[PDB]
Write an enzyme that holds these catalytic residues in place. Structure first.
Site, PDB file in Angstrom:
ATOM      1  N   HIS A   1      -1.547  -2.184  -5.265  1.00 35.04           N
ATOM      2  CA  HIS A   1      -1.344  -2.243  -6.708  1.00 35.04           C
ATOM      3  C   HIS A   1      -2.283  -1.225  -7.362  1.00 35.04           C
ATOM      4  O   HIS A   1      -3.264  -0.787  -6.747  1.00 35.04           O
ATOM      5  CB  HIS A   1      -1.667  -3.633  -7.264  1.00 35.04           C
ATOM      6  CG  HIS A   1      -0.895  -4.786  -6.704  1.00 35.04           C
ATOM      7  ND1 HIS A   1       0.460  -4.965  -6.858  1.00 35.04           N
ATOM      8  CD2 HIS A   1      -1.313  -5.850  -5.969  1.00 35.04           C
ATOM      9  CE1 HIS A   1       0.842  -6.070  -6.246  1.00 35.04           C
ATOM     10  NE2 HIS A   1      -0.221  -6.632  -5.700  1.00 35.04           N
TER      11      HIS A   1
ATOM     12  N   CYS B   1       1.447  -1.985 -13.322  1.00 27.02           N
ATOM     13  CA  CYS B   1       1.132  -1.473 -11.988  1.00 27.02           C
ATOM     14  C   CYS B   1       2.171  -0.399 -11.635  1.00 27.02           C
ATOM     15  O   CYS B   1       3.367  -0.721 -11.609  1.00 27.02           O
ATOM     16  CB  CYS B   1       1.245  -2.658 -11.006  1.00 27.02           C
ATOM     17  SG  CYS B   1       1.156  -2.105  -9.282  1.00 27.02           S
TER      18      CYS B   1
ATOM     19  N   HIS C   1       4.892  -0.976  -8.875  1.00 28.09           N
ATOM     20  CA  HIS C   1       5.684  -2.151  -9.168  1.00 28.09           C
ATOM     21  C   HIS C   1       6.134  -2.243 -10.622  1.00 28.09           C
ATOM     22  O   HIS C   1       6.583  -3.314 -11.047  1.00 28.09           O
ATOM     23  CB  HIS C   1       4.878  -3.406  -8.782  1.00 28.09           C
ATOM     24  CG  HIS C   1       4.563  -3.466  -7.317  1.00 28.09           C
ATOM     25  ND1 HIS C   1       3.292  -3.712  -6.844  1.00 28.09           N
ATOM     26  CD2 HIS C   1       5.350  -3.324  -6.222  1.00 28.09           C
ATOM     27  CE1 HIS C   1       3.305  -3.711  -5.519  1.00 28.09           C
ATOM     28  NE2 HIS C   1       4.543  -3.478  -5.110  1.00 28.09           N
TER      29      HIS C   1
ATOM     30  N   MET D   1       6.028  -5.871 -12.904  1.00 31.77           N
ATOM     31  CA  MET D   1       4.579  -6.049 -12.870  1.00 31.77           C
ATOM     32  C   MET D   1       3.899  -5.372 -14.057  1.00 31.77           C
ATOM     33  O   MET D   1       3.406  -4.244 -13.994  1.00 31.77           O
ATOM     34  CB  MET D   1       3.997  -5.533 -11.540  1.00 31.77           C
ATOM     35  CG  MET D   1       2.555  -6.029 -11.365  1.00 31.77           C
ATOM     36  SD  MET D   1       1.994  -6.055  -9.655  1.00 31.77           S
ATOM     37  CE  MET D   1       0.255  -6.454  -9.886  1.00 31.77           C
TER      38      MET D   1
HETATM   39 CU   LIG Z   1       1.604  -3.774  -8.000  1.00 29.14          CU
END
Ligand SMILES: [Cu+2]
Length: 99
Positions: A37, A84, A87, A92
């Protein structure tokens, strides 16, 4: 404040994904599950005068290992949106309000 990166069931989310902190409070973003992440602030959804390049990780830097952390202190009051990078299309995304 501490924010977890990933949910324990594997959900690609910040936990919590909406939080409130005090002006001058340090946020520590901690790898929890589903990494890698990173955290990036959205240049259009931060208060005026904030430089997003100083508070974001570089887009290509990643937290890869269990327990890795990224910390940042926010001072300017208002709402900040962050996400993120790997993601971001997966949901996210999060928000912090500095009071
Ligand atoms: Cu992530």
């Amino acid at each position: 404040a501490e924010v977890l990166l990933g949910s324990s069931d594997g959900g690609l989310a910040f936990v919590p994904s909406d939080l409130s902190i005090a002006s001058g409070e340090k946020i520590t973003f901690k790898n929890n599950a589903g990494f890698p992440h990173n955290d990036l602030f959205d240049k259009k959804e931060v208060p005026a005068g904030v430089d997003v390049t100083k508070i974001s990780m570089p887009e290509e830097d990643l937290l890869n290992a269990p327990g890795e952390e990224y910390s940042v202190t926010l001072t300017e009051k208002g709402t900040y949106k962050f996400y993120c990078a790997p993601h971001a299309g997966a949901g996210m995304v999060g928000k912090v309000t500095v009071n």
